[model samples]
Target: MQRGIVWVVDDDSSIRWVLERALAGAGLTCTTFENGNEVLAALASKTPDVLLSDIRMPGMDGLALLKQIKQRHPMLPVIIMTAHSDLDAAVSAYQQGAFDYLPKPFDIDEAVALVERAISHYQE
Candidate 1:
């Protein structure tokens, strides 16, 4: 079993696949969702240690989802990922209670480090 669990929400399958592999390589378990709704539904059953979500999506975008998640699961650490141009949205995410922010095409090491940090903080 994976040592840590991370919930990854992104619209791109390729990104999800790559992240899943990267997380696995880092000894972390990951559950991926194509959109916010699916992840919201899954949250009803299980809560991961960290939430790594893309800032943009079709129906329920990451910012909206982040708002809802913060409302319901305030203690759960959420990290928002975005494109370089979406810096404002990322800042909004911080105001909305996101634990951290990451830019698209983020380095795997940085992502892993952030996830580890979040998990460590959660345990405290």
Candidate 2:
């Protein structure tokens, strides 16, 4: 009876565009951003059921943004996506109270499923 709002932030435009297409197939509404500062600016404009961001970005890295978000919304359920190289930083982010990681090149179904679970859990 409900669909979740998903926000995606990554340095690349291709990934962000693809994610919107993938999420739309599951009937999820999505917003994409290339920089985390932009994400922070719009954080008040909307509330997402789940936020998917890259582990590294030009403005704000994944762990850094994850910590900042948790400060305001501790139970917000932030998911950090990363390349194989950043697994260590991704794991370290958990102490900051985050780090649900889906590695790069992940499947669309997998992405959608993860957000679905987060939406359900947040409402739980």
Candidate 3:
């Protein structure tokens, strides 16, 4: 079995590709989505151990998605990301129960470490 299951939602294909490879390399199974609605729909049949989402997107932004996810799965760890590097966004993410806040152009290793932490947290 995989160490953990991570769902990544981002509009940028490059970001999703990087996350998929990095998470997989770290022994975590990763599923990528271009938007939150797809992930929300997927959750009807499956639940990932962690969720990594971008703060901005075409439909259903990360903060909104985080809110909906928390309502249904309060225990699920959600890692929110943003390219804007806005303090308010980070604070908002935390306020919405995000497990971690990742700014864009982040180090790949650091992101993986955060995911590992989320996995460990969920296991605990």
Candidate 4:
């Protein structure tokens, strides 16, 4: 339990599965959602130590969710994911105050590292 809690939001089931698997392997509690809507609903019940959200989803993409998250929980860090070509999404996410931006096809190594650091920082 000391490993911390990490939440992942992505319409891509593979992405969700990948993170859940890796984070769990690292001894962290991992929960995932298919879209921003699901995340918001869950937020009513709990907060993650860190949130890794995909930029492009069916509805209420990461940017929209980022705004909502920052509005209510500024200290809760959010990491936004986007494709290499979707550079604008990354840029826009920063304007909305994302904790960080990760380009898609990203290595799980880096993502996990980011989440690990986020976990420690948040708990601090």
Candidate 5:
């Protein structure tokens, strides 16, 4: 069995690749989606232990998606990440019930630690 399931949503393939490797290295099952819509669609049949999503995308921005996910799965832990680092965005993410906000150009170790923490918290 895996430590936990982590869903990663990002328009950038590079971001997804990096996160996939890192999450897998940490012994967690990671699924990648290019957009929030895709993640939402997948949520219909299954749920992940934690979700990490980018704040910006072509359709259905992360905040909007977060609201939708929270409505359906209030207990699901969603971590929002963004390259556009701004206070307002961070505040909005938190207000939308994001478990955490990660600014872009994040440290890989930090990102992994945050995900691990979310998994641990969820398991508790």
Candidate 6:
């Protein structure tokens, strides 16, 4: 059977592309979405094992998405990405049920490690 899947939700195509590539390269399957709304809609039918989402977006920002996910799927893990200046919001995300908060412009290696760790957390 296949292992868990990772979902990357970011408005920036570059961020999504980079994360998707790194996660998939690490032997993990990934699905990329351009916005939180799309991800939320998809969740009605499909649920990724892990979620890596950006905190800021055009509509239904990451925090809001996080809340909805927690309400319906409390056990699913969610990792949030934010800018350095968004530390406050990141903290808030954690309080709301995010598994981890990663700052933007973080090294790909660090991100891969975070994702791995988050996935491992679920296994335990």
Q: TM per model?
A: 0.73, 0.71, 0.74, 0.74, 0.76, 0.75
Model 2 ranges off by over 4 Å: 1-3, 58-61, 83-99, 103-109
Say which prediction, candidate 2 or candidate 5, comes out ahead on TM-score.
5
lDDT of 6 by residue, 1-124 (tens): 2477888777647877788787888678887787666677778888777887766754344566666666666555777765444355555556655677765554557766787788777675
Query: Stretches of candidate 1 above 4 Å error?
Result: 1-3, 58-61, 83-97, 103-107
> Which one wins on lDDT?
5
Residue-by-residue lDDT tens digits, candidate 2, 1-124: 3467888776547877778887877788878876555565677666677877666654344566765666566555667655345455555456654538875555556766776677777665
Q: Which residue runs of candidate 3 sit more than 4 Å off their true CA positions?
A: 1-3, 58-61, 83-97, 103-107
Candidate 3 lDDT over residue span 1-124, tens digit each = 4457899877647877888887888777888887666677788788888887766754444466765666566555777756353455445556555787775554557776777788886675
Q: Compose the digit string of candidate 1's lDDT tens values, residues 14-106.
A: 768877888887677877887666677788777787887766664344566776675566555677665345355555556655677765545
Candidate 6: pairs in clash:
none
lDDT for each of the candidates?
0.69, 0.66, 0.70, 0.69, 0.71, 0.69
Which candidate, 2 or 3, has the higher TM-score?
Answer: 3
Assess candidate 6 and give its lDDT. 0.69
Q: For residue 21, what is the lDDT in candidate 2?
A: 82
| Number of the top-ranking candidate, with TM-score as the measure | 5
lDDT score of residue 21 within candidate 3: 87
- Model 5, 67-88: lDDT tens digits are 6676566556777766353445
Candidate 3's TM-score? 0.74
**Candidate 4 per-residue lDDT over residues 13-122, each given as its tens digit:** 78778888888987877888876667767877777778887667544444666666655554567786653454555555556545687755456787778778877765
Model 2 lDDT at residue 16 = 71
For model 5 the local lDDT of residue 73 reads: 64
